Amino acid sequence: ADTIVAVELDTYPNTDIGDPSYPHIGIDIKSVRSKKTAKWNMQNGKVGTAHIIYNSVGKRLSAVVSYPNGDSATVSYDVDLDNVLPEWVRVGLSATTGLYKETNTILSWSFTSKLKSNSTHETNALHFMFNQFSKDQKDLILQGDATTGRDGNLELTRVSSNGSPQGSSVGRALFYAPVHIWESSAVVASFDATFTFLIKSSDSHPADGIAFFISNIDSSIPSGSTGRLLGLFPDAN
Amino acid sequence: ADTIVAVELDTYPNTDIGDPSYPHIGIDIKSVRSKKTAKWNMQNGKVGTAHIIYNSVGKRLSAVVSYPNGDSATVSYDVDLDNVLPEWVRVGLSATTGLYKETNTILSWSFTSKLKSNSTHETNALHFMFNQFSKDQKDLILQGDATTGRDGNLELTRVSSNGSPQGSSVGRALFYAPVHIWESSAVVASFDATFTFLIKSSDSHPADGIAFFISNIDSSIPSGSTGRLLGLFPDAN
Amino acid sequence: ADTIVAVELDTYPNTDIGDPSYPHIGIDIKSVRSKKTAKWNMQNGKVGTAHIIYNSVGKRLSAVVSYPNGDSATVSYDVDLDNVLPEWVRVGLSATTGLYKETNTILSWSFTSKLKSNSTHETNALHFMFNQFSKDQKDLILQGDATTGRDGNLELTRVSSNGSPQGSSVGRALFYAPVHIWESSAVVASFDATFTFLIKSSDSHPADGIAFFISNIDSSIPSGSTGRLLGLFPDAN
Amino acid sequence: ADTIVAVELDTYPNTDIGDPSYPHIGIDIKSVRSKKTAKWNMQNGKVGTAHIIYNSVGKRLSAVVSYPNGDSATVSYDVDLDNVLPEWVRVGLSATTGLYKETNTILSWSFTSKLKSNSTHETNALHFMFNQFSKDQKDLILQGDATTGRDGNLELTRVSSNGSPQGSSVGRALFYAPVHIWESSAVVASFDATFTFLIKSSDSHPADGIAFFISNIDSSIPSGSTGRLLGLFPDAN
Ligand SMILES: OC[C@H]1O[C@H](Oc2c[nH]c3ccc(Br)c(Cl)c23)[C@@H](O)[C@@H](O)[C@@H]1O
Ligand SMILES: OC[C@H]1O[C@H](Oc2c[nH]c3ccc(Br)c(Cl)c23)[C@@H](O)[C@@H](O)[C@@H]1O
Ligand SMILES: OC[C@H]1O[C@H](Oc2c[nH]c3ccc(Br)c(Cl)c23)[C@@H](O)[C@@H](O)[C@@H]1O
Ligand SMILES: OC[C@H]1O[C@H](Oc2c[nH]c3ccc(Br)c(Cl)c23)[C@@H](O)[C@@H](O)[C@@H]1O
Ligand SMILES: [Ca+2]
Ligand SMILES: [Ca+2]
Ligand SMILES: [Ca+2]
Ligand SMILES: [Ca+2]
Ligand SMILES: [Mn+2]
Ligand SMILES: [Mn+2]
Ligand SMILES: [Mn+2]
Ligand SMILES: [Mn+2]
């Protein structure tokens, strides 16, 4: 199976798999059962911003999610990703719907990774930033139901012609280049990611959420990973 | 055929194809016959640095090549790359040898491209930096004789076990992700590239040189493009 | 007198000093009489974006001004700033009103300067970005009527309590740190600046405009430089 | 008194003030008595690199110091700098000698700070990088014995004509612009700093060390702060 590290913006409480009984943000290390969560007051129809930050010195993965009205939720977890992830990875965004649904619209996404070696003034780095997505966005690998270009956005899950989100959908977008996320001889390895999103739901309950994730380079959507599994995990272990 | 825009560091004068009778730097637009050149005093065995700069507003492609002793050569050419290149490209480094030879060793390479739209505060961008190259450098596409990892460097052309450059060699390295180099609706499109290199030759005449290039995404080494064609062009038209 | 290099967004045609008979953008080298101008269709009450770009290799100063509806104006001028400016400078924004008036509201401002030496991998650089301005913005030097903090913006010229722009006003904001804009031993010196602005006028004719400028470090508003002199020049020579 | 947060590279063990009995790196919050230290094997005459990293989400200040041979030391400390520092600060480097001495030579220094607001896509940021220091480095405030320009370096403490470090010396260099290090309404505030240094000593014991520090904007060298107080603190409380 794939190796997954993710920050989840989980809009639907699945208590059977350890979700608290409210929308929440979470840090997921090789399991959909978050290692740490925080209560998140998701604002229907508003544009939110998620920031994710990590460095190999502090060994603390942190995320904050905020809206323009100033409300925010944060979660941090002590983890040495050198000991979890493979050296080379791909990075991406994933989202799902299940019985319940929501738009999983990404308006922007940026990422920076740096490896600083012990050799003086020697750094390798990658940075990308998307503030618009075209219909043919060649530097993205789209999986599942994900599409680009609708109003210049990235729609991770299926939306009808009229804008209505569909159930039982899963989609992901991965940056085309592999990323060298750590190296044994690096003195510092760090990364940051930011994305903005618009989650909207008309009926009783948004679901299921959006995640930023880091995976093995050949990661694909696991079979049956719609709904609560967020397009990331093959089961809820 | 491919579409190529390149900055050449040409170490060997091929007067039959318009080279001046001295090593030179040149700007090549869809032809190995440079649109503009400047005399370049290549320092055998020293580490040089090339900087390449362009933006769609000024429409001027510029390059400077320097050594630590302060000697430098510069060349600029007025060109609207919006009207030359396809919208999506790959970027890379290329080098060759022919009857005569040299090491074509790359010690570092960085690149930044930005597309700034008319939509306020909306930019797409890509940046990468290599100061070391590993034996398995997954975010590079190596073509021809190019290898990575020897002393942490990128060797564009063939070098023997003992360090001796070989003749009739061609190799290229392209960044793995396609790059969105221009867009009709962009207000500014800009890019910059820098690389450091060590060209060394023992005998009578180094050849043939190193180039930074931008190509169609599916660009491959043209058949028979060793020596004076720099791994870039199928002929000298 | 000060030494000034500026990009002007000139909203009011003063034909006596060489303005064309329409709003225009211009490149000003040591004189308010622009070396080059382009027609600019200023959109009353809309947020515009100006980008300014220069490098010492190409020796071409360029500016583009755009609005979200896609309309833009561009101007470029060949100039070697190494031969014009002092080595150390301050950078800033300036605006004025005269008999006629407008809001000269700055919503964001960024700047990057880099000096790349002949010594391998040695660069000096400065970058700043403002997307909000507080009432006490300590890293700005405010001159004349300029204020910060009103709706988180920078108001270069005087606006009343009720939002009405006042006539005969001049104000500037300079970044607090001096900037090393060129150096004889640098192989490349480059800078970029971007700012977003909202110019609004109720009556017959907006005036007078906004400029991005680079000056001697001790630059101050010249006496009598309201109106057509843009807070930059002591006279119209 | 000033408010100081610092990372110390402490070359001389002063056990009376809580130093361990070996050279060490330490995190100092409002006291020279480090909150956390780690053993540091200082390599006489070699160029070291210090990286310092912090963000307001994770609330963990980290530092690593390394040499090209791969040896490194790291220290991290949980601290919410929002609750320690004033909103506006200056950042700098400090060093001292006492009865014993060493060169405190800085070869490069970079710093980045970012404030990301809850308003979507609104960030304020400052970045600077020095890889060479001139005799008149106008964007630095030099205090005490600090000088710039000797071999293009920053010498924090006094060195004679012939290169010999002098005792009882203290000097600091602060970036000229104040830095907005936190803001109550910011969702993320982060900073990073890196510097390279060459500490050399001829005799029995190097002393006293180098520190990266963040202070109130009007910070000056406290009276009597040579030697073990590192130019940072007025006493050893
Ligand atoms: O989209 C929200 C959820 O819908 C499904 O689970 C259900 C939530 N409430 C229900 C009520 C009845 C039935 Br049958 C089901 Cl499967 C569910 C499943 O698709 C879940 O994976 C998912 O998280
Ligand atoms: O490496 C330098 C050059 O060597 C070859 O051309 C020759 C340069 N001097 C010669 C002398 C004899 C013969 Br045969 C040849 Cl092909 C050459 C060719 O491989 C050229 O493409 C190349 O630029
Ligand atoms: O604000 C626009 C302009 O107003 C003034 O010039 C005039 C423009 N039309 C006028 C009509 C009458 C008189 Br008196 C004057 Cl000074 C002017 C002056 O303040 C100018 O410097 C300025 O550019
Ligand atoms: O430079 C190293 C140290 O030298 C001085 O302390 C001494 C270290 N060993 C000594 C031996 C004798 C005397 Br007197 C003194 Cl003050 C010292 C003092 O200047 C200290 O602050 C300093 O850390
Ligand atoms: Ca859930
Ligand atoms: Ca040639
Ligand atoms: Ca005018
Ligand atoms: Ca000590
Ligand atoms: Mn969950
Ligand atoms: Mn040539
Ligand atoms: Mn004008
Ligand atoms: Mn100590």
Residue numbers in the entry:
A (entry chain A), B (entry chain A), C (entry chain A), D (entry chain A): 1 to 237
Please share text taken word for word from the publication where this structure appeared.
Lectins are carbohydrate binding proteins unrelated to immunoglobulins that display no enzymatic activity towards the recognized sugars. Lectins purified from seeds of the Diocleinae subtribe exhibit a high degree of sequence identity notwithstanding that they show very distinct biological activities. In the present study, we used mass spectrometry to determine the amino acid sequence of a lectin from Canavalia boliviana seeds and solved its crystal structure in complex with Xman and the dimannosides Man(α1-3)Man(α1-O)Me and Man(α1-4)Man(α1-O)Me. Furthermore, we characterized the anti-inflammatory properties of Cbol, adding more data to the repertoire of wide biological activities displayed by this group of lectins, despite their highly identical sequence.
The carbohydrate electron densities of M13M and M14M and Xman complexes are well defined in all subunits. In Cbol:Xman, however, extensive interactions are observed in the binding region. The O1-linked mannose of both dimannosides, M13M and M14M, as well as Xman, are bound to the monosaccharide binding site in an almost identical way to that observed for ConA, CGL and ConM. Other than in the carbohydrate-binding region, the complexes do not present any significant structural differences when compared to the unbound protein.
